[PDB]
Amino acid sequence: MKRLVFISKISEEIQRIGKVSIKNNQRDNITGVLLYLQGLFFQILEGENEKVDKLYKKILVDDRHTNILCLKTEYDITDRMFPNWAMKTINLNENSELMIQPIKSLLQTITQSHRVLEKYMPARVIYLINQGINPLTVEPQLVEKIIFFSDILAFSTLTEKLPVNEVVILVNRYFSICTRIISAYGGEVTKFIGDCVMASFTKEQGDAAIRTSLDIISELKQLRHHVEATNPLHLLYTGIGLSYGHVIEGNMGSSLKMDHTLLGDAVNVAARLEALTRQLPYALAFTAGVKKCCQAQWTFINLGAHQQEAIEVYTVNEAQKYYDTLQITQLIRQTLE
Amino acid sequence: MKRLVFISKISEEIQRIGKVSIKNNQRDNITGVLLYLQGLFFQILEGENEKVDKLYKKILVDDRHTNILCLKTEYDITDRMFPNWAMKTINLNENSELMIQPIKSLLQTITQSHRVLEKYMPARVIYLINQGINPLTVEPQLVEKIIFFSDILAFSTLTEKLPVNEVVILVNRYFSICTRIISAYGGEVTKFIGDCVMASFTKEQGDAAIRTSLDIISELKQLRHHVEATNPLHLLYTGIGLSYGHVIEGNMGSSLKMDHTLLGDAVNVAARLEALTRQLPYALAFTAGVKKCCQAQWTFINLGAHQQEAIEVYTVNEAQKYYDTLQITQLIRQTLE
Ligand SMILES: Cc1cc2nc3c(=O)[nH]c(=O)nc-3n(C[C@H](O)[C@H](O)[C@H](O)COP(=O)(O)O)c2cc1C
Numbered sequence: 134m135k136r137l138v139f140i141s142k143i144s145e146e147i148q149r150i151g152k153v154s155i156k157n158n159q160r161d162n163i164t165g166v167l168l169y170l171q172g173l174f175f176q177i178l179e180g181e182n183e184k185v186d187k188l189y190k191k192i193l194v195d196d197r198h199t200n201i202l203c204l205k206t207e208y209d210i211t212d213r214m215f216p217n218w219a220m221k222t223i224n225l226n227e228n229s230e231l232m233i234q235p236i237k238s239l240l241q242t243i244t245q246s247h248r249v250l251e252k253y254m255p256a257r258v259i260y261l262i263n264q265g266i267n268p269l270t271v272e273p274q275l276v277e278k279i280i281f282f283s284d285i286l287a288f289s290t291l292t293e294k295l296p297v298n299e300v301v302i303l304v305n306r307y308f309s310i311c312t313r314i315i316s317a318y319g320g321e322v323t324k325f326i327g328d329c330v331m332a333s334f335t336k337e338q339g340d341a342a343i344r345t346s347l348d349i350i351s352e353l354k355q356l357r358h359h360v361e362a363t364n365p366l367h368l369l370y371t372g373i374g375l376s377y378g379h380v381i382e383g384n385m386g387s388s389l390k391m392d393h394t395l396l397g398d399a400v401n402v403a404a405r406l407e408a409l410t411r412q413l414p415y416a417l418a419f420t421a422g423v424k425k426c427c428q429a430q431w432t433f434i435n436l437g438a439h440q441q442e443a444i445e446v447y448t449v450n451e452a453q454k455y456y457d458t459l460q461i462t463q464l465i466r467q468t469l470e
Numbered sequence: 471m472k473r474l475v476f477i478s479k480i481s482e483e484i485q486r487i488g489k490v491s492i493k494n495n496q497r498d499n500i501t502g503v504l505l506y507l508q509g510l511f512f513q514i515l516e517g518e519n520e521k522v523d524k525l526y527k528k529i530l531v532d533d534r535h536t537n538i539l540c541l542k543t544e545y546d547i548t549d550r551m552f553p554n555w556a557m558k559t560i561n562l563n564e565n566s567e568l569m570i571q572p573i574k575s576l577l578q579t580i581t582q583s584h585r586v587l588e589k590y591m592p593a594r595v596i597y598l599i600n601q602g603i604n605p606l607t608v609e610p611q612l613v614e615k616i617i618f619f620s621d622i623l624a625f626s627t628l629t630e631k632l633p634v635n636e637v638v639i640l641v642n643r644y645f646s647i648c649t650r651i652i653s654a655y656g657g658e659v660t661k662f663i664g665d666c667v668m669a670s671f672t673k674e675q676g677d678a679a680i681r682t683s684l685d686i687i688s689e690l691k692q693l694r695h696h697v698e699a700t701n702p703l704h705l706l707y708t709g710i711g712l713s714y715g716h717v718i719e720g721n722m723g724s725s726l727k728m729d730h731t732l733l734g735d736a737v738n739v740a741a742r743l744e745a746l747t748r749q750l751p752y753a754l755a756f757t758a759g760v761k762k763c764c765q766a767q768w769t770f771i772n773l774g775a776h777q778q779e780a781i782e783v784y785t786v787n788e789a790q791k792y793y794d795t796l797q798i799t800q801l802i803r804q805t806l807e
């Protein structure tokens with residue numbers, strides 16, 4: 134058998150949910166409980182492994198709730214936790230009694246706090262937590278990654294002139310755009326380094342990594358002529374480095390502070406290729422290793438060898454600029470005065 | 471009045487706790503509940519602001535529990551949540567009844583999950599959460615920081631030779647040492663960047679920032695002759711850059727991913743000074759701005775001007791090396807073969 138636990142955010146209607154679960158959970162011989170408290174669901178489900186999983190994939194796509202996080206998975210259990218409840222619904226709001234109110238209030242406060250912490254988490258950890266894996270004890274492994282690096286053109290002159298709030302508005306907008314597109318193509322964001330976005334793709338995701346690069350460049354171009362001139366967003370440009378190689382993926386740090394990152398020379402290479410694009414007529418630079426993972430009929434352009442042994446640099450025709458890097462940089466400064 | 475909520479980890483004895491709280495919580499006219507479940511405390515406390523705070527400082531130093539996190543603070547409440555319980559203790563393990571078991575199990579699972587997420591958190595966020603501040607809505611502010619940067623000497627040759635697990639053992643040991651010392655002197659760690667540790671100190675913490683730098687250098691020296699030669703730890707060296715200036719402190723990112731970092735040119739400067747020490751006869755390099763925040767009678771040594779306008783670089787005599795940077799680097803490589 135098998136048992137999992139998840140939480141989710143909602144979007145008499147819950148009564149239609151439990152009427153169903155009961156019938157289907159006997160049809161497939163399942164038990165568990167559904168709690169509702171302050172617009173959040175909590176569910177425990179237990180039963181034969183194939184039957185419990187056929188159900189939770191159905192649950193994942195139910196549009197009655199969002200931001201689903203599976204906290205816990207127990208494999209090959211032997212004793213059910215609620216053998217007599219096909220699916221028991223406990224509306225924790227209807228309960229007004231004294232002795233459940235403390236536990237009611239704490240469940241609310243921990244889970245809400247929890248939901249806030251989730252947004253500062255490494256995507257990989259949240260993924261591990263969903264798959265039942267313990268992030269703190271997982272063993273760091275050597276994996277093959279495409280490494281992605283993007284940051285803001287002449288950002289230090291954007292921070293130089295704008296007031297703090299426009300800086301933040303601008304950085305957050307940049308980060309929204311980057312992560313939405315990376316995540317849509319199947320990449321994972323590793324972390325933010327100042328103005329920089331570090332991500333990874335798999336070795337079957339070369340095309341998706343170039344497409345990600347071009348799309349970001351594209352949305353920033355549209356964004357610049359969508360807004361008025363006096364909007365700092367009018368001044369937002371990026372350059373993107375891709376590398377490929379082996380990296381160590383895992384957790385690092387002491388008891389008092391943990392991080393779940395990627396170590397390996399390819400990390401440095403993508404960052405240097407990213408910075409290389411400030412001297413290139415292209416916004417995207419990548420290695421030959423990235424090119425090998427690319428199946429699509431890209432028009433690859435060779436930018437020669439660069440720097441402790443030199444490496445070959447490539448780009449695609451679609452990453453060409455219609456601007457000069459020191460032109461944009463003096464233009465940014467002239468605008469802000 | 472005022473009300474807070476915290477959780478902590480434990481180290482009939484709980485019976486001695488509640489017997490006390492009751493008497494003192496009436497003495498100072500306080501109410502709330504204490505839950506115990508699977509080696510974790512949960513407490514809600516409410517009352518007049520001066521009285522509730524005199525108590526929680528006492529609680530913080532009680533050695534019966536550790537890893538105390540205050541989740542929630544409510545200011546100037548008007549209605550108490552438990553007006554009749556000076557301090558009601560609910561041992562959630564003693565309860566075996568059916569209808570509390572689901573809520574019992576969920577409270578356990580969320581809070582445990584919670585505890586795991588806390589270890590991937592920005593120190594500043596955990597601090598904000600403790601002080602009652604909402605991290606997601608706090609407004610990013612411009613602050614004066616000493617910026618700290620440390621990373622591992624010729625790390626790319628350590629990753630080149632050692633197997634993955636020795637890399638991780640070695641990085642984790644480095645990070646334990648760095649964060650323990652930074653945190654002891656009063657700094658905060660911002661994040662980890664690969665082999666790099668980024669931290670900040672206040673402008674009244676110059677001496678503490680140099681002391682932090684020297685102590686780390688010191689512990690790594692001791693560590694190298696404490697271990698056998700064949701231990702990768704025998705090969706672990708660091709360089710440290712300090713800068714000073716204005717940075718933006720706050721949260722950045724989209725709904726789907728949030729980070730709580732420091733933006734500003736001083737971040738880049740400390741990183742470049744850090745890298746500068748690979749060509750210097752010292753392991754610590756800092757700006758004149760850092761020197762100004764230093765009150766202690768340091769023997770400051772001037773390393774000239776470096777690089778887009780050049781800045782003056784300083785170090786202290788105590789940061790001198792007894793090694794050559796390219797000697798250690800070829801020595802590391804020779805060892806590993
Ligand atoms: C929070 C939540 C929990 C649910 N739990 C169950 C459950 O335990 N068992 C179940 O059969 N359906 C559950 N559902 C509803 C599923 O969508 C359901 O399996 C589906 O409507 C079945 O459709 P079908 O019989 O046509 O295949 C749940 C829905 C929600 C929102």
Ligand SMILES: Cc1cc2nc3c(=O)[nH]c(=O)nc-3n(C[C@H](O)[C@H](O)[C@H](O)COP(=O)(O)O)c2cc1C
Pocket residue numbers: 487490491492493494495504511513515525528529532534535557
């Ligand atoms: C989890 C926990 C909760 C506590 N809650 C209270 C409380 O609510 N009120 C209280 O007076 N003491 C509480 N204490 C114990 C304090 O240490 C206590 O105030 C102290 O022993 C008083 O000493 P004094 O009367 O000599 O000043 C708590 C201790 C623990 C571990």
